[model samples]
Target chain A: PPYTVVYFPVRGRCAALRMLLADQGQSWKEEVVTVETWQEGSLKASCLYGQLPKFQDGDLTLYQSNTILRHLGRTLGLYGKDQQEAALVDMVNDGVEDLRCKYISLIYTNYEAGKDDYVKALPGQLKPFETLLSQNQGGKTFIVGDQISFADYNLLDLLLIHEVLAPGCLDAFPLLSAYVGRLSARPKLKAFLASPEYVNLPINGNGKQ
Target chain B: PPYTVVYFPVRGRCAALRMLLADQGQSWKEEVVTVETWQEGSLKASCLYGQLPKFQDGDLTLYQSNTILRHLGRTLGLYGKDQQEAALVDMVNDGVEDLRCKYISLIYTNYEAGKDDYVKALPGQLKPFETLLSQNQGGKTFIVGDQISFADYNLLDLLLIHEVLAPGCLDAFPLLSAYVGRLSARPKLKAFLASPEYVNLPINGNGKQ
Candidate 1:
């Protein structure tokens, strides 16, 4: 395999890139880090930013989840058709990242007390993505253009996890509901989503979602 | 003007791109959004992510600070010399962003109570950039490669502000301290740094650094 992902057993930050690899039919190895191993501090210290989801492409090593995704997007021809579309792809991914940060914070730090407020504010947080879909191809195509850029895989993972966090959360947003359904039905992706490797892993490390 | 930036008067998130433009010798207009205007609810409602730093490049509009930087990067040929360099650029920028997020949270959310611990952790936060520089061209050039990329501008701005927030923070890291001086000496960026537009603006919205 030309790609390798080093992350914890949880599906937290690595979910989107894993989905991207599966959907693109790219083979990759997983170097799962256990909590005990991480606490040993050697591998964690070796990480450039002291974080997980470290990725390797051939001889090149990379950190940061978005960096890994963008690299694969570039190599796999999934970035966009042109520079403009690529910028739009970046914009959509940045929006998705902002929400993911908030979700992670709530999940790890204050899930017991923060869940209600987080849920109450979910629509406002999600509305921008809904609007994004509505503007591009009338919610029919991918997020930025006719082709599926890396951001779609990311946004798909975000929406899927959010559904687990808040059931029927997409019901109020017609475009998002349809978008999830449409993307989930892709053959390879559908298989990956249902596989024991994905389904059996917890969404987060602390076991909230 | 071929470029326009719609943001609050505070430098906040807009500082880097503004620095990038001025340093790159690109002319742009600033549609500074006053707090009074933002409170009116109309413009905020219209924002894609309900946030500021909305940008316009000719007929196309964009949001997200990194997205805007990258658009300029792509259009102006500041991305990289090749695909590998671009990925490295993205990696550097993502590391910068992770630290910037921590800096912002400390500034706006928990400055008074969190300043001590934040200052204590500053070295760990900044070491990765120094490491990045050390690995490439003996820490003599830009963050990713010999030529300056958009990430250089962003990382430069991050280092400058950290100096203001915690004076002498970079003194311990020889490469970072020298890197800041070298980048700051660029004639156009030096002029922009001294100008009232950059000098007069507060770093954050709530009157903190």
Candidate 2:
């Protein structure tokens, strides 16, 4: 493998990148860090921000999941057709990241107690993504433009995990619902989703998924 | 000015871009949204993500601080010299963002209860940046390379605010301490930091500096 990923046994932040590699027909190795192993102090200390999903492509090591995604996007020529669309791609990814931050806070902190309000406010949180779809050829196409970018994978992972967080949450947004179905059915990603490598892992580290 | 920044009265996420503009001598209009104006609901509803720090560069409006930063970075020749350095810049920004997220949580959610522990873990959280400085021309240059990048402003703001949050937080990391002094001393940036506009606003939304 020319690439390596160091993360926990969960699907939390690594899921999207995993799908990206699989969908792009790239090979990589996963170095899973168990809870017991993470507690040993040395590896955690080595992490850039003391967090997981550290990645290395060839000799270039990187941290931050979004950075890794953008790196891969840049390398694979999946960023966008041009600089303008690239910014739009970044904009969409940033929106996905904002909502993902809220979800992580809810799940890892006080999930049971926070579930109701979090779900209650979910539609507003998801509205931007829905609107993003609506503006782009009435949701029949990709999130940014017609081409699939790394952000779509990220947004897909976000949407999937949100479904786990609040089942049928996308039902209200017709475009988003269809978008999820469309993106998930991409042949390589579809197969990868069914494989034990993805299916067996928890969506989050804390098991809220 | 062609750039119009729509944001709250506070700094929060907008501080870095403001510094970037200041240091780079780029003038922009500040479309400040007060509590009263935000409560009026129209503009907030109009926002894609319903968040402040919305940016308008001519007709191309954007949200998310990092996206705006990167856009400015790309256009202003502040991203990096090439793809590899760009990835490293993103890595630095992402690390800054991760810690900033934790800091925001503490300030808004449980400041009193979380402050002590957060401060205790601050050293480890900051070490990676210090190490980055150490590796790059022995802390003589920018975060990623010899050229200034967008992440430098972001990291500068992070370090400045952390110093405010925990006075002398960077004192132990000599490289970071010097880096802060070096970046802060940039002519226009120093002026902005001293101006009534920057000095008057809260660092966060909840009246905390």
Candidate 3:
């Protein structure tokens, strides 16, 4: 699958693609763009769509984070087997993207409230995920369909961001806290993260912070 | 197909569905709600997702704008039959939605200081759409294929707003200025607007101001 994905070295948005790439064990080029370097490279290559998380395969290039992720989920068979389950997988996946965007908007963007905004706005947006994760099912291990789909992988990978980005973050989302630990025990996902590029992605938010 | 769509009286988020519905000549009920009435509706009665832009037949109930629009576009055959064309149409459609959200944020939510933000934002966004619309050579008429489509309808509808939404908005972008007027003038679209519900829609920013 002649492919590459280019984006700023931001994990919350781009590294998920890297994880998917790693999961498939596919060979592809990854070019990192600093805030300064992006405008010159990946941003230009996607033809004036000056955004990250763009995918390239042969002559085709596309953007949109979830669209590309879901596309890979389908072609790579990471999504799931059944149509309804796939759509549910997608619903949870898209839900993460939505929650991420809302979190960023409330915390990072120029919303009216000042420094206290992120702390103030955090729980309301996040509690729903906590509840959903808790009530996922009676003794249900993953997000859907009994097996770990792309959605479960994404959820675990995303929620486990406590040590990677911020501490004291996952405390309230206790269900998710347990969920990530269970998912991390997967043999393949653990071995895949052994690569230096995956292992050494600065745990601090220094990449962007 | 026996389907009904109910929503708040205000077009607000329902315009895309309404546009596609008109294009399909879809026979259904259009229930406009007052602010007092929306939450009273049941999630099951209202939607599969517990939201507006709900659709119902004998047994199917679906919600979400993108999902509903996709269903209508596919069912009504406004989207192209081919996979590649449909994907392209979606890319452009979602692009328009992104710009619309940004435009609204600037004008309504953010309320920028000097000059309308669409003036500040539209030129950059319009250039890409202008490129796509001009390069579309369906006998040099449609936004996607020859004659009308959901894609064409969307492009034409979005463009027409420039002439009114920000007044003199079309002045700067000559290619797009003419492009929008040409599609809006289509007899079928004009006929739909001639209906009582549409005619009563106040054209000059209506009640949005």
lDDT of each: 0.93, 0.91, 0.60
Tell how far residue A68 is off in model 2, in angstroms: 0.5
Q: Which fraction of the native contacts appears in each prediction?
A: 0.76, 0.67, 0.00
For every prediction, compared with the true complex, DockQ reads: 0.87, 0.75, 0.24
Interface RMSD score of candidate 2: 1.0
lDDT of 3 by residue, B1-209 (tens): 58677666555455656666765566677766555576666543334334465655446455555555655665567766564455466566766666666655654655546236457666777777767666777225666555456666666656655555677766766667666667556666666756776666543233542
Sort the predicted structures by lDDT, highest score first: 1, 2, 3
TM-score of chain A of each: 0.98, 0.98, 0.76
Q: What is the lDDT of residue B87 in candidate 1?
A: 95
Candidate 3's TM-score? 0.78
Q: Which candidate is the best by DockQ?
A: 1
RMSD of 3: 4.4
Model 2, residue A123: distance off in Å is 1.4
What clash count goes with each model?
0, 0, 0
Candidate 3 Cα misplacement greater than 4 A, ranges? A39-46, A77-94, A110-120, A127-158, A161-175, A182-184, A199-209, B39-51, B55-58, B74-82, B112-117, B138-154, B171-179, B182-188, B199-206
Write one digit per residue (lDDT tens) for candidate 1, span A39-78. 9999989999899888998899999999999999999999
Comparing to the true complex, what docking class would candidate 2 get? medium
Q: Which residue pairs show backbone clashes in model 3? A: none
Better of 1 and 2 by TM-score: 1
**Deviating ranges (above 4 Å) for candidate 1:** none
lDDT, candidate 2, at B59: 89
